[PDB]
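User: Predict Prelamin-A/C's structure from this.
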Amino acid sequence: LAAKEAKLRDLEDSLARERDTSWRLLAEKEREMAEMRARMQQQLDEYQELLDIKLALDMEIHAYRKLLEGEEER
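Assistant:
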């Protein structure tokens, strides 16, 4: 018992410091992933926004294609 209650106290000192570090880090990751899942959903939308624009231009190209079809026919 020369330094036996000094090491047991230093153990709970680092275990508290460890758990603390691990929790600030975990918290940092869960915030970083939430930010990621946010950009990911915004993206799937920004895409569907564009894919809907694309399908309308695909229809217009068919209409103009039909106009010409009936125009260029002799």
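The two ends are 110 Å apart (CA to CA).
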